[PDB]
Amino acid sequence: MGFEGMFTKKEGQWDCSVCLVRNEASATKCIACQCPSK
Amino acid sequence: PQVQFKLVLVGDGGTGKTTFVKRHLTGESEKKYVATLGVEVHPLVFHTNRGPIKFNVWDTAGQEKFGGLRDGYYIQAQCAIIMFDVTSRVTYKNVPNWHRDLVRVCENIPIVLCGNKVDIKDRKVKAKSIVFHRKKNLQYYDISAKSNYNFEKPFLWLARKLIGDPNLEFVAMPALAPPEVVMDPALAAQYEHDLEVAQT
Ligand SMILES: Nc1nc2c(ncn2[C@@H]2O[C@H](COP(=O)(O)OP(=O)(O)O)[C@@H](O)[C@H]2O)c(=O)[nH]1
Ligand SMILES: [Mg+2]
Ligand SMILES: [Zn+2]
């Protein structure tokens, strides 16, 4: 068996292209590094 | 599918954090610098019997002391490695300080304690003296970054804890920088036994 989507991205989340932290849909900038959403 | 975890690598300056993370060659070639936080994020892929796992290892660019890292450093940290230098007792004295600074922001995340530079025979923080805890989310390993000794051990233990699979295995070792020093096999055998009895 694989990882069974145990840690899959939730609906609307996006990964920061600068620091790879996972952000919520409503976040316009990364919660960690503050870089604007791609 | 591939899973992804943020791993914060912290510890006193000069303990070998950068030397350690840079052993993973692909993670070095694909590292990402975060200017606003003074951090290099190394995406370390490990291939398990259940698929690939990527540890995004956060390695500071400076010499910050405990409590001196920008707040964004710990944000969304899902696991951690606290490193010290077995030839410098002060770096081990500060391990509880880093642990306190980490748990203040992240609370209950799996953490591995790593004593680096065990290739140096004049070891000041001896295996017997390692303070061990009853915590299920804390584990210790000797490591020697320059010899790749036990390089995969912290990541395998974290992967098993995060996935919840004690039988998880790495089907192949990642491409690692060639060893620059030799880890004495007799010392390795003696250290490994000393840590077994101390943990139990
Ligand atoms: N003998 C030995 N020396 C090491 C090892 N790791 C690091 N060193 C050295 O420790 C010094 C600081 O290394 P560095 O990676 O910059 O530590 P950092 O400040 O925690 O990132 C350097 O001179 C390293 O070459 C090791 O595993 N064995
Ligand atoms: Mg460094
Ligand atoms: Zn970011």
Domain residue ranges of chain B, discontinuous segments joined by +:
1-200
- Which residues are CB-contacts of B131 (< 8 A; sequence separation ≥ 6)? none
Distance from CA of A2 to the nearest CA of B (A): 5
Closest B-chain CA to A1: B50
CA-wise closest residue to B59 among B105, B8, B14: B8
Nearest in space to B99 (alpha carbons), one of B149, B145, B140, B54: B140
Ligand 1 atom index nearest CA of B19 = 15
Are B87 and B146 in contact, with CB atoms under 8 Å apart? no
CA B41 from chain center: how many Å? 14
Give the sheet arrangement for strand B51-60, strand by strand: B32-34, B39-48, B51-60, B3-11, B79-85, B111-116, B138-142
* Assigned domain for A1 exists: no
- For chain A, what is the domain count? 1
Place of tokens 């790879």: A20
Nearest to B116 by CA among B86, B91, B95: B86
Position A20 in a domain: yes
Q: Is residue A32 part of a domain?
A: yes
Contact status of B6 with chain A (Cβ, < 8 Å): yes
For chain B, where are the alpha helices, taking DSSP H only? 17-21, 25-29, 89-93, 95-106, 153-163, 185-199
* B194's tokens: 């000393």
Q: Are B16 and B88 in contact (CB under 8 A)?
A: no
CB contact set of B178 (below 8 Å; sequence gap of 6+):
none
State the resolution, in angstroms.
2.0
Q: Which residue of A has its CA nearest to B36?
A: A33
Whether the Cβ atoms of residue A33 and residue B36 lie closer than 8 Å to each other: yes
Distance of alpha carbon B32 from its chain centroid, rounded?
A: 19
Experimental approach was X-ray
Question: What token pair was written down for B145?
Answer: 């970054």
- On the 0-12 / 13-18 / 19+ scale of CB atoms within 10 A, B31 is middle
Contacts of B6 in chain A (CB under 8 A): 20-21
Q: Could you tell me the residue range of the domain that residue A24 belongs to?
A: 12-38
